[PDB]
Design a protein around this motif. Structure first.
Motif, PDB file in Angstrom:
ATOM      1  N   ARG A  26       2.232   8.212  -4.269  1.00  0.00           N
ATOM      2  CA  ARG A  26       3.600   7.821  -3.933  1.00  0.00           C
ATOM      3  C   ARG A  26       4.519   9.035  -3.802  1.00  0.00           C
ATOM      4  O   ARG A  26       5.364   9.090  -2.893  1.00  0.00           O
ATOM      5  CB  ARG A  26       4.115   6.855  -5.002  1.00  0.00           C
ATOM      6  N   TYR A  29       3.668  10.725  -0.668  1.00  0.00           N
ATOM      7  CA  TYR A  29       4.147   9.843   0.389  1.00  0.00           C
ATOM      8  C   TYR A  29       5.613  10.102   0.706  1.00  0.00           C
ATOM      9  O   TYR A  29       5.993  10.236   1.875  1.00  0.00           O
ATOM     10  CB  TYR A  29       3.919   8.404  -0.070  1.00  0.00           C
TER      11      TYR A  29
ATOM     12  N   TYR B  41      15.424  -5.176  -5.416  1.00  0.00           N
ATOM     13  CA  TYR B  41      14.781  -4.008  -5.991  1.00  0.00           C
ATOM     14  C   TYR B  41      15.106  -2.813  -5.114  1.00  0.00           C
ATOM     15  O   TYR B  41      15.070  -2.897  -3.884  1.00  0.00           O
ATOM     16  CB  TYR B  41      13.262  -4.183  -6.147  1.00  0.00           C
ATOM     17  N   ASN B  43      14.754   1.602  -4.470  1.00  0.00           N
ATOM     18  CA  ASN B  43      13.706   2.609  -4.509  1.00  0.00           C
ATOM     19  C   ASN B  43      14.288   3.972  -4.181  1.00  0.00           C
ATOM     20  O   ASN B  43      15.388   4.090  -3.634  1.00  0.00           O
ATOM     21  CB  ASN B  43      12.577   2.281  -3.527  1.00  0.00           C
ATOM     22  N   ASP B  45      12.541   5.651  -2.054  1.00  0.00           N
ATOM     23  CA  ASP B  45      12.241   5.525  -0.633  1.00  0.00           C
ATOM     24  C   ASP B  45      12.796   4.194  -0.129  1.00  0.00           C
ATOM     25  O   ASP B  45      12.065   3.252   0.170  1.00  0.00           O
ATOM     26  CB  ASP B  45      10.735   5.619  -0.406  1.00  0.00           C
ATOM     27  N   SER B  46      14.122   4.126  -0.038  1.00  0.00           N
ATOM     28  CA  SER B  46      14.774   2.895   0.384  1.00  0.00           C
ATOM     29  C   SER B  46      15.871   3.078   1.415  1.00  0.00           C
ATOM     30  O   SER B  46      16.148   2.129   2.156  1.00  0.00           O
ATOM     31  CB  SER B  46      15.369   2.168  -0.830  1.00  0.00           C
TER      32      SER B  46
ATOM     33  N   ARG C  37       7.419   3.261   9.936  1.00  0.00           N
ATOM     34  CA  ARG C  37       8.407   3.812   9.022  1.00  0.00           C
ATOM     35  C   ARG C  37       9.113   2.749   8.198  1.00  0.00           C
ATOM     36  O   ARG C  37       9.863   3.094   7.282  1.00  0.00           O
ATOM     37  CB  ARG C  37       9.427   4.628   9.801  1.00  0.00           C
ATOM     38  N   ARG C  39       7.225   0.758   6.501  1.00  0.00           N
ATOM     39  CA  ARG C  39       6.284   0.614   5.401  1.00  0.00           C
ATOM     40  C   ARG C  39       6.490   1.651   4.304  1.00  0.00           C
ATOM     41  O   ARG C  39       5.684   1.715   3.371  1.00  0.00           O
ATOM     42  CB  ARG C  39       4.859   0.676   5.937  1.00  0.00           C
ATOM     43  N   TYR C  40       7.544   2.462   4.405  1.00  0.00           N
ATOM     44  CA  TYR C  40       7.854   3.441   3.369  1.00  0.00           C
ATOM     45  C   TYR C  40       8.341   2.751   2.106  1.00  0.00           C
ATOM     46  O   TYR C  40       8.045   3.192   0.990  1.00  0.00           O
ATOM     47  CB  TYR C  40       8.910   4.421   3.879  1.00  0.00           C
ATOM     48  N   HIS C  41       9.095   1.672   2.271  1.00  0.00           N
ATOM     49  CA  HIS C  41       9.833   1.043   1.188  1.00  0.00           C
ATOM     50  C   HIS C  41       8.925   0.087   0.427  1.00  0.00           C
ATOM     51  O   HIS C  41       8.516  -0.949   0.961  1.00  0.00           O
ATOM     52  CB  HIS C  41      11.041   0.308   1.750  1.00  0.00           C
ATOM     53  N   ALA C  42       8.612   0.426  -0.817  1.00  0.00           N
ATOM     54  CA  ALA C  42       7.753  -0.392  -1.658  1.00  0.00           C
ATOM     55  C   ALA C  42       8.443  -0.621  -2.996  1.00  0.00           C
ATOM     56  O   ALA C  42       9.581  -0.198  -3.215  1.00  0.00           O
ATOM     57  CB  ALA C  42       6.378   0.260  -1.850  1.00  0.00           C
ATOM     58  N   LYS C  43       7.747  -1.310  -3.895  1.00  0.00           N
ATOM     59  CA  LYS C  43       8.295  -1.684  -5.188  1.00  0.00           C
ATOM     60  C   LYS C  43       7.741  -0.785  -6.288  1.00  0.00           C
ATOM     61  O   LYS C  43       6.607  -0.308  -6.214  1.00  0.00           O
ATOM     62  CB  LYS C  43       7.986  -3.150  -5.505  1.00  0.00           C
ATOM     63  N   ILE C  44       8.558  -0.560  -7.310  1.00  0.00           N
ATOM     64  CA  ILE C  44       8.154   0.206  -8.482  1.00  0.00           C
ATOM     65  C   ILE C  44       7.533  -0.769  -9.475  1.00  0.00           C
ATOM     66  O   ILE C  44       8.228  -1.626 -10.025  1.00  0.00           O
ATOM     67  CB  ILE C  44       9.341   0.946  -9.107  1.00  0.00           C
ATOM     68  N   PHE C  45       6.224  -0.647  -9.690  1.00  0.00           N
ATOM     69  CA  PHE C  45       5.536  -1.449 -10.698  1.00  0.00           C
ATOM     70  C   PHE C  45       6.028  -1.048 -12.080  1.00  0.00           C
ATOM     71  O   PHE C  45       5.696   0.031 -12.578  1.00  0.00           O
ATOM     72  CB  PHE C  45       4.030  -1.254 -10.593  1.00  0.00           C
ATOM     73  N   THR C  46       6.812  -1.914 -12.702  1.00  0.00           N
ATOM     74  CA  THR C  46       7.547  -1.552 -13.905  1.00  0.00           C
ATOM     75  C   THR C  46       7.125  -2.336 -15.131  1.00  0.00           C
ATOM     76  O   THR C  46       6.957  -1.748 -16.202  1.00  0.00           O
ATOM     77  CB  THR C  46       9.047  -1.748 -13.667  1.00  0.00           C
TER      78      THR C  46
END
Lengths: 48, 48, 48
Positions: A26, A29, B41, B43, B45-46, C37, C39-46
Motif C-alpha cells: 500500500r 502503491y 471512510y 484515506n 489515497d482519497s 486511477r 482503483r487507488y482509493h481503498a479502505k484501511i483495515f482497522t
C-alpha cells in the motif's frame, strides 16, 4: 492436540505477516500513485 | 479530473478545504474522521 | 414468366444524385469512460 495447535499457530502467524506485506504494498502503491497522476496531467496539457 | 472551479459550483469552500486537508493526515486522524461521519471512510489515497 | 414483363432497351435518365444520408443516430458508436486511477482509493483495515 499438539499437531492441531501447531497448525493453528502457524496459520495465525501467516495471517499476522500477510497484513504487514499488504501495508508495504500500500505504501509503495501511494508513492507510485503521485507520479502517475503527474504524468497524466502533463499528457493532458500536451493534449490541449 | 475535476478542477476546483467546476467543483465549487455546487459545493462550498469549507467542504473543499476539508477534503483538501484530509489528504495528508495521520493514520489516527483519518480513523477519527471516518468514525465521525455517517457511514464514510477516508484515506491517504482519497483526494485525487 | 410474367405477362407484365416490361420491354425497353434504353438507358434510364438519372433522377436523383447520391448524397450523404440525413441520419444522425447509429453510424456512430457508444462512448465509454474508464480509468484505473479510480482503483487507488481503498479502505484501511482497522477493526480486525
Amino acid at each position: 492436540n499438539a499437531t492441531l495447535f501447531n497448525k493453528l499457530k502457524e496459520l495465525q502467524q501467516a495471517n499476522a505477516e500477510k497484513s504487514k506485506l499488504n501495508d508495504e504494498l500500500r505504501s509503495k502503491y501511494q508513492i507510485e500513485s503521485s507520479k502517475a497522476a503527474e504524468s497524466a496531467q502533463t499528457l493532458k496539457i500536451l493534449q490541449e | 479530473a475535476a478542477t476546483s472551479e467546476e467543483i465549487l459550483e455546487v459545493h462550498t469552500k469549507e467542504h473543499l478545504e476539508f477534503i483538501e486537508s484530509t489528504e495528508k493526515m495521520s493514520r489516527e486522524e483519518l480513523l477519527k474522521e471516518t468514525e465521525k461521519g455517517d457511514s464514510v471512510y477516508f484515506n491517504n489515497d482519497s483526494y485525487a | 414468366e410474367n405477362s407484365l414483363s416490361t420491354t425497353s432497351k434504353s438507358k434510364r435518365q438519372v433522377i436523383v444524385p447520391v448524397c450523404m444520408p440525413k441520419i444522425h443516430y447509429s453510424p456512430l458508436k457508444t462512448g465509454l469512460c474508464y480509468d484505473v486511477r479510480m482503483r487507488y482509493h481503498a479502505k484501511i483495515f482497522t477493526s480486525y
